[PDB]
Design a protein around this ligand. Structure first.
Ligand SMILES: Cc1cc(Br)cc(CNC(=O)c2ccccc2Cl)c1OC(=O)c1ccc(Cl)cc1Cl
Ligand SMILES: Cc1cc(Br)cc(CNC(=O)c2ccccc2Cl)c1OC(=O)c1ccc(Cl)cc1Cl
Lengths: 161, 161
């Protein structure tokens, strides 16, 4: 439910709930990340979820925030960007893709977060599918629910980053 | 469809499409209003829809932007506020409610708009119901669709205000 999210007290409880709503919706890995107004400090964003630790580490250390095409997207758009070959346009972005894939992030989307007080962030979710046609079918069945979720997550989570 | 919205050229065509999507979804009256970053100039907002002209006129002239509880809500929240007695807390807000009602705005909601470039706005939609239980039933059946709609409307409409 969306209400357990808003009425949850701490960071552990809130992120636990967001993460179970995400698995219950059928997503495997989740990242919620949020920055205050006018910050581009991606190495110091509020970040919760279940991305493997080694991958989050590589990401920060290699400076992927500057490369990751979903980052520049969130900056200019409120619409989701699905993780497709298309979005990986330069060749550093291709390297980025072969690494994410090796870390298990192949099918998925990133929902941009733009808060009432100027917050900037992203909710990203992975899908385990035997392929991208099954993965889109799945995504298309959950989108409206997810779209609501990302907003409840931003409103309630903004008050604790 | 959402694509006709994004791929539409001018203000007339885009607002025509937004407005038919809204009637097709079962809403009667619609207001989309949008302000650029750091503006509180509500008398000079980009505003399209089908609210009666006399009511828009009264609103601007009486300075309702300062009274209308949905305005302060959009400023602090990304969640919808449903038009219920509850939200009309002071007595100037009650006057505001008896006037809106006399102008046909009784059941409805307002979806706050927070753009990628800091835009501020609202999508508001009225529902004609023989009452608020039918009106909520209706609203609850369309919410996920609407929630998607308000974001497509903001992304595509931001580029023409
Ligand atoms: C900091 C950060 C760390 C990591 Br690990 C991952 C992301 C977002 N990127 C993805 O989730 C992703 C998408 C497709 C393929 C592979 C990946 Cl890794 C991050 O980005 C954010 O949290 C973020 C994104 C946008 C905005 Cl505006 C703000 C933030 Cl804080
Ligand atoms: C300028 C403006 C004119 C008018 Br006529 C109406 C609104 C929004 N209010 C409603 O739609 C409403 C809701 C419940 C009951 C009665 C009414 Cl009249 C307006 O507000 C906006 O357009 C607006 C609202 C919030 C934000 Cl942040 C920005 C804007 Cl431009």
């Amino acid at each position: 439910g969306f209400l357990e999210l808003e009425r949850s007290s701490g960071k552990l409880e809130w992120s636990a709930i967001l993460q179970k709503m995400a698995s219950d919706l059928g997503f495997s890995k989740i990242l919620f990340g949020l920055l205050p107004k006018d910050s581009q400090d991606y190495e110091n964003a509020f970040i919760v979820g279940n991305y493997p630790a080694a991958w989050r580490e590589h990401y920060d250390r290699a400076g992927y925030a500057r490369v990751d095409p979903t980052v520049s997207h969130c900056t200019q758009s409120v619409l989701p960007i699905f993780w497709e070959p298309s979005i990986y346009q330069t060749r550093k972005q291709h390297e980025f893709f072969e690494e994410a894939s090796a870390a298990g992030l192949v099918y998925g989307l990133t929902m941009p977060l733009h808060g009432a007080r100027g917050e900037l962030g992203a909710l990203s979710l992975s899908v385990e599918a035997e392929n991208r046609a099954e993965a889109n079918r799945f995504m298309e069945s959950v989108l409206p629910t997810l779209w609501m979720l990302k907003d409840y997550a931003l409103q309630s989570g903004a008050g604790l980053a």
